[PDB]
Structure 1
Amino acid sequence: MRGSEVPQLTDLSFVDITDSSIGLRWTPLNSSTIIGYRITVVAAGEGIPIFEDFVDSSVGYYTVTGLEPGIDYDISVITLINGGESAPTTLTQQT
């Protein structure tokens, strides 16, 4: 990219990091027209994908499920606004 361009969820971070889901927090972007935020998961270590889930447009709190413990997961949470995607801020975390 170049520096940053589209504003990204600069407070995107993870909580309730149990073996049975992973709970997210970020700030809700009432921009005007945002499509949503798209979470994706992979098993961090490979590009083995799991699923991409979507939320409304107005969420500040979500919880991903469909994990299995033992491996690390790169939980990506891409914001997609008016004709533009923010910088990907994933976090690597184990289960």
Structure 2
Amino acid sequence: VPQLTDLSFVDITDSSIGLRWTPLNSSTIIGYRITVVAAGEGIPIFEDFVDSSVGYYTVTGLEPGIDYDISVITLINGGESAPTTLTQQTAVPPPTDLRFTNIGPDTMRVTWAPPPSIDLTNFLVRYSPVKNEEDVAELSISPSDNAVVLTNLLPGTEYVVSVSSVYEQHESTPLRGRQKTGS
């Protein structure tokens, strides 16, 4: 009974994991069971079914920073495949609500809302002009701060500011916007 040979993860967030695979070709194949387990102790979380034509599924409601085993099993009438199992760790949750305030010709203020009740080791701000991406700046901001003021900026110039949350060596997907300076 064939297994999937191309199961892969996509859209990996702090609370969810996406799956894609190529559905197989068989009259016999009726669907795919999906099994989610908390990795390590192997704590069963849930199972879920999709039909034979479906090559996509999203695991939701997961907890951030934790390791899960996800497997997909091919189903026939009164039988099934060996599981195809992969292990994936949910992301660090990003900040939200990027505002730009105090717009000068050589300075701006950047505010974000931290991910609530998550204890990060730091934030990480990257800024660069739009027209010269190779010239990037990195500031490491205290996990208790929610704002930084940038200085020494070129006037009349559009910047890309991004803020990522960081725990140990893992970091979130970036929260990214664009403000330009005055003249």
Common topology (TM > 0.5): yes
TM range (shorter): 0.7 to 0.9
1:25–1:61: 8 Å Cα contact kept in structure 2?
yes
Alignment of 1:10-29 (within 5 A): 10-29=5-24
Gapped runs of 5+ residues in structure 2? 90-182
**Mapped partners of 1:57, 1:91: distance in 2:** 20
Give the TM-score taking structure 1 as reference length: 0.83
Structure 1 match to 2:62: 67
Q: What root-mean-square deviation, in Å, do the aligned CA atoms of Structure 1 and Structure 2 show? A: 4.8
4+ residue runs of structure 1 moved beyond 6 angstroms? none
Per-residue deviation at 1:7?
Answer: 1.4
- Flag the structure with more relative contact order, 1 or 2, with Cα contacts below 8 A and sequence separation at least 6: 1
Deviation larger for 18-27 or 74-83: 74-83
DSSP-derived class of the 1:55 partner: strand
**Mapped partners of 1:39, 1:66: distance in 2:** 15
The structure with the larger Rg is 2
Per-residue deviation at 1:17?
Answer: 1.1
1:30–1:58: 8 Å Cα contact kept in structure 2?
no
Deviation larger for 24-33 or 80-89: 80-89
Residue of 78, 87, 97 corresponding to 1:92: 87
Per-residue deviation at 1:82?
Answer: 4.2
Per-residue deviation at 1:49?
Answer: 0.9
Per-residue deviation at 1:70?
Answer: 2.4
Gapped runs of 5+ residues in structure 1? 1-5
Aligned length: 90
**Mapped partners of 2:32, 2:70: distance in 1:** 13
DSSP-derived class of the 1:59 partner: coil
Q: Deviations over 1:23-51 (max 9, x none)?
A: 11111124113221111111101121111
Give the TM-score taking structure 2 as reference length: 0.45
